């Protein structure tokens, strides 16, 4: 499975969550930014590694990083 | 156990294979107000029935591609789709929406599962976690 | 006004020229980085992205067509002017067997006038291989003033074509209902463009070309020949040549057509004098196809009840109305395809590019074997250049067909429109199509190329009895040999009693030699020809695999289920799912460009070597033919080593030993093509992040000198690096072959 | 020398004349240094010191002209002056670009030709 | 609208349109099924050894010929038939070693893919490793025997020829 | 002269059997052993 | 060498007329007949488009039949 890490430079714009094709990410309350939200990655067993969440992130540097890890049949995107 | 009519479809070569029945299958259910043509994520055009529809797909990404098509390519939008994971013993598990809202909104009760209170440029540099097993983000400090 | 279909806006403004990117909303933002500069020319003509109305796009396309026609007329004007001012056309008209065609002289600048070679007759110029002289001789030109007149007419037509494109967009542009009239368009193009065009050309041939060519073949000097209008004017002069013109246009209306059988002949061979086809036989061809195309133009219902409706014919081709074994296409059939083809310009462009490239390839294969112009077959450089050029144009056009079949999929395909029809049913079993194409490509790759590797190993072992040769294990193409035998039996004094000679001497028949050199002779098909035709089948099939795979999986696949949301030209979808690099349809057009190169290069190599060892040569007084390379295709072209030694190493003697001669530009361009091929590999093997990280250090060195620029320097994008690498590979690798072919054929004839 | 070279005359007295070998084989043979193959070899000696200065030193002027016109045009700028070359400011940076040799030594001593280490972006 | 509303020759596989196959005349006609389902791989009721035995007999028989006609020994009859025989022998032993190691690697616990207990593949009915070992033994026996039967018919081709021309009735 | 492979060296019957063993007799057993080693389950 | 082909005589006009009438007999069974334009159905069922199409196919059939019959002696 890949590791998706969310850092405190997150601004809760939700764009990483909206860009995820496999529903790894969701928003949780934070009170660490003024949106009141921060991304989280519980279903990271579903992560394929497309890094659409990283492309959608506006902060410099990214508040979300995907580290490609051990490949499973889900992270390899195999329908066979 | 899952309610819904299979969408009217002629079949394709892009559908379920062995791994669907030996590893895992996914199902997406949705209610449509009219009988109308959508695009299968497996290739082709199917027709959703008026009422409750249930479709088995091979990947969760296919079920989420269909769901994104339902809520964006149709007026009125179909936003009530539910995605389940089916196991070879028959066990069905409701996965999407994980909570019951929709990941893009914020629910009180979800909980942190990837948060690292840092700022990326301050992970522990790899010279110190060498023969440990941890790699640089699965840690706890900040250097 | 005459059809009430115009009233177009878009006033001719000048201010809209100093604001690049005005067509795209993000292109008119404000540059910022350098990617904008390259994005400006990446979708400049893509009128589909710019706006959303089909009618505005259709109007833009119509005026762009007019501007393109203007560009082609400017090119034609330039070619006729070059033949009328900087050519030895008159000298070649006098002696077209000892004079080399030339239509380009080089200015006396640095070392530069060495490229002006002696062309015979004291003319110092460059030997052209475009076949313009042989074409003008067949059309009826005798002096350069007529060429100058044609150049002026083409320039006037170009000005007229750029006025018709401005008047059909800025003054009175058509409505969308006019563009969607495919019945009327097909009727007019079939009857008025092709039918009347070939009828008018048949009139020209019967009254200008046939006279002039008959006197030329008789022996008359080019300026001793009457001008074409005298052939038109007095019927006594024209009746000296033909005795069927004494009865005028009377036998035609009274249906006594065998009266006309001396200028409408049906001989079907080659003129022994010139080497080209029988000119009377050509005129009869154009008369017959004019009658066929005009008659074909009355097929589609337009405003008068009679005719077909293509929508009805499309919607009825379906089960259970089909042939029983063709009934697998289901009960919808071709129902939604008339609305696909009348609302998508990309669908039409895909079909038309496929047919245009295929027809250009057919043109290439029909003009070496049935040489249609005087003294064409004996100028081997021209024959080589024409075949090679039309094969390359055909291959590029065919690749663009797949490109636009993929653009139709991502953009113009609507699942709700076409449900359970042939287009839906193809997308609904494309794994079967692609897997069977994968297997046939593998079968053909083992049974063509690995047989060549077998032959290499057997020849290096010293056991040529074990080879796939004509002296080892024979692989005779019995079906093509049988077709060749049927073609030479048909034309007997049979199944075609009207023709005297075979349709080409390539099938069989005799030998036509003109000026000592061979115009045409039978092309024997042995084991080497079996092997190279299966090479051709294999390469065409892998090109089809690469291109069709991108077309069929342009929407989605099992890997990326929402590929149509990503676009038609996108680099990847990240390093996940193992790494989805080059999954777009555009990347399949990228990879099929290489495969079209590899396919057409072997076709032009097969043609060059086979024609040079088994057709072209030098007939002596007795009749013995000494071929150029000496009939070494049947034993050297069956191994890879013989292709590298007896074709590439041996026949590149004339291009590398050309320094200091008049062919030295060919040696320079040979090396230049090698450079551009190798330089392409920098873009093809490397990736974008290296170059962006090296530009970081270069930007640091620039910031330190305070030479910072506002437009921020960025590396070429991923698909742009791919496009640049592909363009460079194709350009260098084709310039190399061009220089090799042309230096070889301009030195040994 | 090329005038007394025994192998340099077999390309003298057997070659096309034209206007590329007749008014070029002379001045060349008078003032070049050929070896044994009858070919002028570009030497680097004390006699070449006042010979190689006109390729080397006079190229340095035009190269610095281009580099200083590209500098003085681009300090006075802002992402539309690179697209649409402002001909007035281009002429202003050409007129100053003519005598760029002096201006270049009037920047190093003043410290306005180089940027500070903390005023230029770097990478990790 | 039209998506499985009209009745066409091409149906979903097993009536399930979400399966990755179609019911075409080549996998679903009565002639195609009558031929394929009665081939030894699929004939109902047979033990794996007899399936393998008939597969091997048919296979070792035709595998002799390509080297008899095309091999390095083809200039002489006796050596050509021997080269074809040992080519069939080597291909048989390699293929059966592959069958044995496929069964050894696949059937480890609950297998993965089509030989998992939950698999619905109708086209792969040898679900047990015992079936695969009986198949390997049968294919080996039958293929080596069919190869030497083709070899013996090619060695005695002069006799089989005089027999089938009635030259033995003098 | 050379109608077949020869050895003008000591124990020249050893290539005759060593080349089959190293190159087409023992390799497929070695491939099977390595395949069974890489596909064995925990 | 060439397929005979006669000039024009009462025998040629008969074949060209009998073939124009067969065209009329079979051209009554077309669809979208009497399609206005000019003389909307004033040609015994057919309009002017349908009459011109029927006579054009009749001329085509006549030229083909006449040249065939002239080739083989009958005409
Ligand atoms: C496809 C279009 C095309 C191309 C590739 C050329 C190419 C060329 N032209 Mg041409 N030309 C063209 C169209 C074209 N022309 C048209 C439409 C006209 C007007 C009818 C001309 C009239 C023209 C003249 C008068 C001359 C050229 C000349 C030339 C040569 C050098 C031009 C130059 O140095 O600048 C060059 C090979 C020059 C040349 O050939 O030098 C001897 C020259 O004298 N051209
Ligand atoms: C018999 C009448 C007629 C003729 C001769 C043409 C001819 C042409 N049409 Mg047109 N068209 C017609 C009727 C006709 N059309 C009708 C009724 C419609 C409405 C359904 C259209 C709708 C149409 C469209 C949408 C387009 C064309 C285009 C073209 C050009 C095709 C370019 C080419 O293939 O070779 C080029 C050959 C050229 C020979 C020489 C130029 C000839 C000039 C233009 C006319 C010749 C006059 C002649 C004496 C009559 C071509 C010149 C395409 C085009 O290129 O746009 C400009 C295109 O976009 N046509
Ligand atoms: C379609 C283009 C075309 C054009 C513009 C012409 C034009 C002409 N033809 Mg004609 N011709 C054509 C096609 C054409 N032809 C074809 C397809 C045939 C084969 C049947 C002929 C066979 C023909 C004959 C036998 C004669 C003409 C003649 C003529 C000239 C006047 C005689 C006449 O009209 O009656 C005239 C300049 C007459 C002529 O020779 O005048 C110079 C003449 O008697 N033509
Ligand atoms: C009738 C012929 C025809 C027409 C009208 C088009 C039209 C179009 N093509 Mg297309 N295509 C064609 C043939 C044609 N093509 C052929 C023969 C090929 C195979 C090489 C392609 C492959 C192709 C691809 C892969 C793409 C297009 C695209 C496009 C669209 C935008 C073109 C553009 O960006 O500006 C003009 C672009 C240039 C002028 C680039 C020129 C640089 C070239 C490579 C160097 C040439 C070297 C020189 C000859 C030596 C446009 C609608 C693009 C698109 O996005 O469609 C929506 C797109 O991605 N085409
Ligand atoms: C010479 C270089 C080379 C070779 C051998 C290949 C070979 C192949 N290409 Mg490829 N390609 C190449 C260059 C090459 N390519 C380059 C330079 C590009 C740049 C754009 C591409 C891009 C490309 C694409 C996009 C595709 C291919 C495809 C294929 C496969 C075609 C199917 C086939 O022919 O089956 C036969 C196999 C061969 C001809 C390989 C050589 C076999 C030798 C002769 C026999 C070996 C004997 C024996 C087995 C050896 C065993 C010894 C043991 C010790 C291992 C094939 C394996 C297509 C494919 O996948 O088809 C299904 C595919 O779509 N190629
Ligand atoms: C199977 C392919 C085949 C093809 C492509 C042709 C093609 C042709 N035949 Mg032909 N023919 C064939 C089989 C074929 N034939 C057979 C099996 C017979 C019976 C033996 C004939 C007997 C025949 C006769 C008698 C004539 C032709 C003629 C012709 C030519 C006129 C075109 C036309 O008929 O309209 C044409 C090139 C005519 C011709 O020779 O042109 C003058 C003609 O006179 N054919
Ligand atoms: C007028 C603007 C301008 C000026 C004053 C400079 C000046 C300089 N550049 Mg530069 N550069 C420019 C534009 C300019 N560049 C452009 C348009 C490009 C893209 C082609 C580059 C890409 C570039 C690279 C990759 C490098 C430089 C480097 C350098 C430095 C020394 C080497 C050199 O000049 O040759 C190099 C010049 C080129 C490669 C092209 C410039 C030619 C244009 C037309 C002027 C020097 C201070 C080198 C450096 O970093 O110094 C340590 C170096 O490695 N440049
Ligand atoms: C009246 C009956 C009749 C007869 C006896 C013939 C006889 C003949 N026709 Mg004909 N034909 C006919 C009606 C007839 N046709 C009709 C109604 C048409 C439609 C317009 C045609 C259109 C036609 C064409 C296009 C050709 C013939 C040809 C031929 C000759 C070739 C023999 C063959 O292969 O068959 C032959 C003598 C061929 C031929 O040899 O031309 C001389 C050929 O080219 N025919
Ligand atoms: C599909 C099909 C087909 C084909 C078929 C085929 C492919 C064939 C074949 C065939 C074959 C391929 C056959 C075979 C066979 C065999 C046999 C007949 C065998 C045998 C054997 C034996 C008898 C052996 C014996 C032995 C043993 C075992 C032991 C010891 C030794 C010996 C020798 C004694 C066709 C189209 C035609 C039609 C129908 C269907
Ligand atoms: C070399 C290379 C680059 C670098 C290439 C670049 C940046 C383009 C080079 C074009 C130069 C920079 C020309 C631009 C210069 C200005 C236009 C000035 C030119 C001067 C004229 C006006 C006279 C990539 O970006 C790249 C990306 C992906 C795969 C492979 C590669 C790759 O191989
Ligand atoms: S890499 Fe792709 S699948 Fe994984 S969290 Fe990011 S967007 Fe989702
Ligand atoms: S896209 Fe980036 S900033 Fe926005 S919610 Fe996701 S991690 Fe936070
Ligand atoms: S290597 Fe390049 S093309 Fe491939 S996945 Fe990574 S970014 Fe995309
Ligand atoms: Ca042998
Ligand atoms: Cl060889």
Short mmCIF file of N, CA and C in Angstrom, two decimals, chain B residues 6-18 21-23 25 35 37 45-47 54-56 88-89, chain E residues 1-5 8 10-12 15-22 112-114 116-121 124:
data_model
loop_
_atom_site.label_atom_id
_atom_site.label_comp_id
_atom_site.label_asym_id
_atom_site.label_seq_id
_atom_site.Cartn_x
_atom_site.Cartn_y
_atom_site.Cartn_z
N UNK B 6 -30.27 -4.81 -12.57
CA UNK B 6 -29.07 -4.64 -13.38
C UNK B 6 -29.39 -3.76 -14.57
N UNK B 7 -28.54 -2.78 -14.90
CA UNK B 7 -28.82 -1.91 -16.04
C UNK B 7 -28.87 -2.68 -17.35
N UNK B 8 -29.71 -2.20 -18.26
CA UNK B 8 -29.91 -2.88 -19.53
C UNK B 8 -28.68 -2.72 -20.40
N UNK B 9 -28.01 -3.83 -20.67
CA UNK B 9 -26.68 -3.83 -21.26
C UNK B 9 -26.51 -5.13 -22.02
N UNK B 10 -25.84 -5.07 -23.16
CA UNK B 10 -25.67 -6.26 -23.95
C UNK B 10 -24.50 -7.13 -23.59
N UNK B 11 -23.71 -6.74 -22.59
CA UNK B 11 -22.49 -7.45 -22.27
C UNK B 11 -21.29 -6.89 -23.02
N UNK B 12 -20.11 -7.13 -22.46
CA UNK B 12 -18.89 -6.65 -23.07
C UNK B 12 -17.74 -7.57 -22.67
N UNK B 13 -16.62 -7.40 -23.35
CA UNK B 13 -15.39 -8.06 -22.94
C UNK B 13 -14.68 -7.31 -21.82
N UNK B 14 -15.14 -6.13 -21.47
CA UNK B 14 -14.53 -5.31 -20.44
C UNK B 14 -15.04 -5.56 -19.05
N UNK B 15 -15.88 -6.56 -18.85
CA UNK B 15 -16.51 -6.81 -17.58
C UNK B 15 -15.69 -7.68 -16.66
N UNK B 16 -16.39 -8.41 -15.81
CA UNK B 16 -15.77 -9.17 -14.73
C UNK B 16 -14.99 -10.37 -15.28
N UNK B 17 -13.87 -10.66 -14.64
CA UNK B 17 -12.98 -11.77 -14.97
C UNK B 17 -12.85 -12.65 -13.73
N UNK B 18 -11.84 -13.53 -13.73
CA UNK B 18 -11.65 -14.48 -12.65
C UNK B 18 -11.41 -13.78 -11.31
N UNK B 21 -14.17 -12.94 -8.86
CA UNK B 21 -14.76 -13.97 -8.05
C UNK B 21 -13.76 -14.67 -7.15
N UNK B 22 -12.47 -14.46 -7.35
CA UNK B 22 -11.48 -15.07 -6.47
C UNK B 22 -10.79 -14.06 -5.54
N UNK B 23 -10.86 -12.77 -5.88
CA UNK B 23 -10.25 -11.74 -4.99
C UNK B 23 -11.34 -10.83 -4.42
N UNK B 25 -15.01 -8.17 -5.78
CA UNK B 25 -15.92 -7.48 -6.71
C UNK B 25 -16.46 -6.24 -5.99
N UNK B 35 -35.43 6.25 -17.16
CA UNK B 35 -34.63 5.27 -17.88
C UNK B 35 -33.78 5.97 -18.92
N UNK B 37 -29.55 6.50 -20.85
CA UNK B 37 -28.32 5.85 -21.27
C UNK B 37 -27.13 6.51 -20.59
N UNK B 45 -22.24 1.53 -23.96
CA UNK B 45 -23.36 2.31 -23.45
C UNK B 45 -24.40 1.37 -22.88
N UNK B 46 -24.79 1.62 -21.63
CA UNK B 46 -25.86 0.86 -21.00
C UNK B 46 -27.00 1.81 -20.68
N UNK B 47 -28.13 1.24 -20.29
CA UNK B 47 -29.32 2.02 -19.95
C UNK B 47 -29.67 1.74 -18.50
N UNK B 54 -28.34 -1.63 -9.79
CA UNK B 54 -27.23 -2.29 -9.13
C UNK B 54 -26.31 -2.87 -10.20
N UNK B 55 -25.03 -2.49 -10.16
CA UNK B 55 -24.07 -2.91 -11.16
C UNK B 55 -22.79 -3.40 -10.49
N UNK B 56 -22.33 -4.58 -10.87
CA UNK B 56 -21.08 -5.12 -10.36
C UNK B 56 -19.93 -4.79 -11.30
N UNK B 88 -15.28 -13.15 -1.90
CA UNK B 88 -15.61 -14.44 -2.53
C UNK B 88 -16.54 -15.32 -1.72
N UNK B 89 -16.60 -15.14 -0.40
CA UNK B 89 -17.56 -15.89 0.40
C UNK B 89 -18.96 -15.30 0.35
N UNK E 1 -31.92 2.85 -24.24
CA UNK E 1 -33.02 2.74 -25.19
C UNK E 1 -32.96 1.42 -25.95
N UNK E 2 -31.83 1.18 -26.62
CA UNK E 2 -31.61 -0.03 -27.41
C UNK E 2 -30.68 -1.03 -26.73
N UNK E 3 -29.95 -0.60 -25.70
CA UNK E 3 -29.02 -1.47 -24.98
C UNK E 3 -29.76 -2.62 -24.32
N UNK E 4 -29.56 -3.83 -24.84
CA UNK E 4 -30.32 -5.04 -24.53
C UNK E 4 -31.81 -4.76 -24.39
N UNK E 5 -32.41 -4.27 -25.47
CA UNK E 5 -33.86 -4.25 -25.62
C UNK E 5 -34.31 -5.01 -26.85
N UNK E 8 -30.60 -9.93 -30.29
CA UNK E 8 -29.54 -10.01 -31.29
C UNK E 8 -28.85 -11.37 -31.26
N UNK E 10 -25.74 -11.93 -30.67
CA UNK E 10 -24.69 -11.88 -29.67
C UNK E 10 -25.31 -11.52 -28.33
N UNK E 11 -25.24 -12.45 -27.39
CA UNK E 11 -25.87 -12.35 -26.09
C UNK E 11 -24.82 -12.15 -25.01
N UNK E 12 -25.19 -11.75 -23.80
CA UNK E 12 -24.23 -11.77 -22.69
C UNK E 12 -23.81 -13.19 -22.35
N UNK E 15 -25.90 -15.13 -19.70
CA UNK E 15 -26.99 -14.23 -19.38
C UNK E 15 -26.60 -13.10 -18.45
N UNK E 16 -25.30 -12.94 -18.20
CA UNK E 16 -24.80 -11.93 -17.29
C UNK E 16 -24.06 -10.87 -18.09
N UNK E 17 -24.63 -9.68 -18.29
CA UNK E 17 -23.94 -8.66 -19.08
C UNK E 17 -22.78 -7.98 -18.37
N UNK E 18 -22.55 -8.26 -17.09
CA UNK E 18 -21.40 -7.69 -16.40
C UNK E 18 -20.23 -8.65 -16.34
N UNK E 19 -20.31 -9.78 -17.02
CA UNK E 19 -19.19 -10.68 -17.20
C UNK E 19 -18.33 -10.22 -18.38
N UNK E 20 -17.07 -10.61 -18.36
CA UNK E 20 -16.13 -10.14 -19.35
C UNK E 20 -16.04 -11.02 -20.57
N UNK E 21 -17.19 -11.37 -21.13
CA UNK E 21 -17.26 -12.24 -22.29
C UNK E 21 -18.60 -12.01 -22.97
N UNK E 22 -18.71 -12.50 -24.19
CA UNK E 22 -19.92 -12.44 -24.98
C UNK E 22 -20.25 -13.83 -25.50
N UNK E 112 -4.37 -19.47 -6.30
CA UNK E 112 -4.78 -18.12 -6.73
C UNK E 112 -5.24 -18.21 -8.19
N UNK E 113 -6.22 -17.41 -8.55
CA UNK E 113 -6.73 -17.39 -9.90
C UNK E 113 -7.78 -18.43 -10.16
N UNK E 114 -7.75 -19.06 -11.33
CA UNK E 114 -8.82 -19.95 -11.75
C UNK E 114 -8.89 -21.25 -10.98
N UNK E 116 -8.52 -21.36 -7.65
CA UNK E 116 -9.07 -21.07 -6.34
C UNK E 116 -10.44 -21.72 -6.23
N UNK E 117 -10.84 -22.03 -5.00
CA UNK E 117 -12.09 -22.76 -4.78
C UNK E 117 -13.32 -21.95 -5.17
N UNK E 118 -13.21 -20.62 -5.16
CA UNK E 118 -14.32 -19.74 -5.49
C UNK E 118 -14.39 -19.40 -6.97
N UNK E 119 -13.53 -19.98 -7.79
CA UNK E 119 -13.45 -19.61 -9.19
C UNK E 119 -14.63 -20.16 -9.97
N UNK E 120 -15.09 -19.39 -10.95
CA UNK E 120 -16.22 -19.75 -11.78
C UNK E 120 -15.82 -20.07 -13.22
N UNK E 121 -14.53 -20.32 -13.47
CA UNK E 121 -14.08 -20.62 -14.83
C UNK E 121 -14.57 -21.99 -15.27
N UNK E 124 -11.69 -24.24 -17.38
CA UNK E 124 -10.55 -24.85 -16.70
C UNK E 124 -11.07 -25.76 -15.61
#
